[PDB]
Design a protein around this ligand. Structure first.
Ligand SMILES: C=C1[C@@H](C)[C@H]2[C@H](Cc3ccccc3)NC(=O)[C@]23OC(=O)/C=C\[C@H](O)CCC[C@@H](C)C/C=C/[C@H]3[C@@H]1O
Ligand SMILES: *[C@@H]1O[C@H](CO)[C@@H](O[C@@H]2O[C@H](CO)[C@@H](O)[C@H](O)[C@H]2NC(C)=O)[C@H](O)[C@H]1NC(C)=O
Length: 463
């Protein structure tokens, strides 16, 4: 079994870096922005304006978080080709090389007196995160024995969320996230990539990719022997043999085929809109600008309350793993969307009514926590399950590629536009999210069937 824990450890490390990179921009903002100002002052000359014009600064710092989503977008198309050509292990190793390059470019921003280097570093780390999000679930679910596949499935979520929380707690003013040690945060996100790069080559290749694609038999037999610790593994090998034959029985569809194929259309629309529901809900607005939101809202020590948001995220992800197994699929999405809309309305009421009673700033805090909480029940995991259960073994690759691309593009939209929207509208930002949620809730209530424990024949015939 040891081989199994080691391999899952490497995959989880990749996922944990994904989480770190998602969450590490919320706390250091007011410091990182300052650096930009300083650098932008140094390149003007004698008659300069003595300050970076606010618009230029807001746009630079918004790019510095949307470029990550651009990296993910470019990933979503590539997840398949490298997986098929190199495999799972080799893809992750090349991926770690790209990760080190991107993070190193991130961390050397201060010395270079350049804000382009950090933007490019975010692009590279975004491509990393896209590929590793694509390639960790595949591998862990690939190797894990039949019974434990469900349990090892959720390790990716715990990993990502713990990574986010670690990033948020390392951005405090007493800890790394300070005036002169912020780039070392980005160096830190470099660091675990080396540990994974030096640990993985001591782990086995996915038997399924070694049998179904490469046609190889003996190496797969050795890998199974060295993974499961069984005297005889004939049954599993035969099962994958018939799996290869079934895959040959119905070859997968190309992306354009899926897009233009009438029969597989309506489920494709459901997948796309559920991803848009996960993202345009506004969760990434919280994960990226919690500190800014709180400081606007009258909180005393915004970084601490952001840590609170991260801890709520972790706790309710644990609850989600322990609950989703016994609740349904549409039901949890509905409940999460409704709770999130209510929490956004409460946030708007708290911001609007802050002047009249300052001691109500605390209310804002709880609202956001509720928000995050109600996101990790309904719209956090459920969209991916619904995407999985709406498609047979044939067209899953293309369907997942489309869902992921839509997810990343909507993430870019929210991450780039939140600053401008908040500046323009003011305390009303969250009202907008509330409206979206309600809108989407309508859709989800009356357009997505319940897929829990429902036969693929029943699912398809329902449409
Ligand atoms: C707020 C977000 C962050 C915080 C996560 C969030 C929590 C989560 C994490 C892991 C699985 C399911 C839910 N819920 C997500 O969906 C999350 O993460 C992923 O989707 C990660 C990997 C997936 O297995 C493959 C798809 C990976 C990408 C194609 C999509 C990534 C989504 C992010 C999301 O931006
Ligand atoms: C951009 O950075 C400069 C330099 O720190 C800021 O200018 C200083 O601002 C203070 C007030 O906060 C003035 O009293 C100082 O005299 C300014 N420095 C100099 C050298 O004149 C500027 O305010 C910053 N602006 C933003 C938006 O960050």
């Amino acid at each position: 079994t040891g081989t199994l824990v080691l391999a899952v450890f490497s995959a989880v490390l990749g996922s944990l870096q994904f989480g770190y990179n998602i969450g590490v921009i919320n706390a250091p903002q007011k410091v990182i922005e300052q650096s930009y100002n300083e650098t932008w002052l140094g390149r003007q000359g004698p008659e300069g304006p003595s300050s970076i014009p606010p618009g230029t600064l807001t746009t630079l710092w918004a790019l510095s978080v949307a470029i990550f989503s651009v990296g993910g977008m470019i990933s979503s198309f590539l997840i398949g080709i490298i997986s098929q050509w190199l495999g799972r292990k080799r893809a992750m190793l090349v991926n770690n090389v790209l990760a080190v390059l991107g993070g190193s470019l991130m961390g050397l921003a201060n010395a270079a007196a350049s804000y382009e280097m950090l933007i490019l570093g975010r692009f590279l780390i975004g491509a990393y995160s896209g590929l590793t999000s694509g390639l960790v679930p595949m591998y862990v679910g690939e190797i894990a024995p039949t019974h434990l596949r469900g349990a090892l499935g959720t390790l990716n979520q715990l990993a990502i969320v713990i990574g986010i929380l670690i990033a948020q707690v390392l951005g405090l003013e007493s800890l790394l996230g300070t005036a002169s040690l912020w780039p070392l945060l980005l160096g830190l996100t470099v660091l675990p990539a080396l540990l994974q790069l030096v640990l993985l080559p001591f782990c086995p290749e996915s038997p399924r990719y070694l049998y179904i694609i490469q046609n190889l038999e003996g190496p797969a037999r050795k890998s199974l022997k060295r993974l499961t610790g069984w005297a005889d593994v004939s049954g599993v090998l035969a099962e994958l043999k018939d799996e290869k034959r079934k895959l040959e029985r119905e070859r997968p569809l190309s992306l354009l085929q899926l897009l233009g194929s009438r029969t597989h259309r309506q489920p494709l629309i459901i997948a796309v809109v559920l991803q848009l529901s996960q993202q345009l809900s506004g969760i990434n607005a919280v994960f990226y600008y919690s500190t800014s939101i709180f400081e606007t809202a009258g909180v005393g020590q915004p970084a601490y309350a952001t840590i609170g948001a991260g801890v709520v995220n972790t706790v309710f992800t644990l609850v989600s793993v322990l609950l989703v197994e016994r609740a349904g699929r549409r039901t949890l999405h509905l409940l999460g969307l409704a709770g999130m809309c209510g929490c956004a309305i409460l946030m708007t009421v708290a911001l609007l009514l802050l002047e009249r009673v300052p001691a109500m700033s605390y209310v804002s805090i709880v609202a956001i926590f509720g928000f995050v909480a109600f996101f990790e029940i309904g719209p956090g995991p459920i969209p991916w399950f619904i995407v999985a259960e709406l498609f047979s073994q044939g067209p899953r690759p293309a369907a997942m590629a489309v869902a992921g691309f839509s997810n990343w593009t909507s993430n870019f939209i929210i991450g780039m536009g939140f600053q401008y929207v908040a500046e323009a509208m003011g305390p009303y930002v969250f009202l907008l999210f509330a409206v979206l949620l309600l809108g989407f809730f309508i859709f989800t209530f009356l357009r997505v069937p319940e897929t829990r424990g429902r036969t693929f024949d029943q699912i398809s015939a329902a449409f």
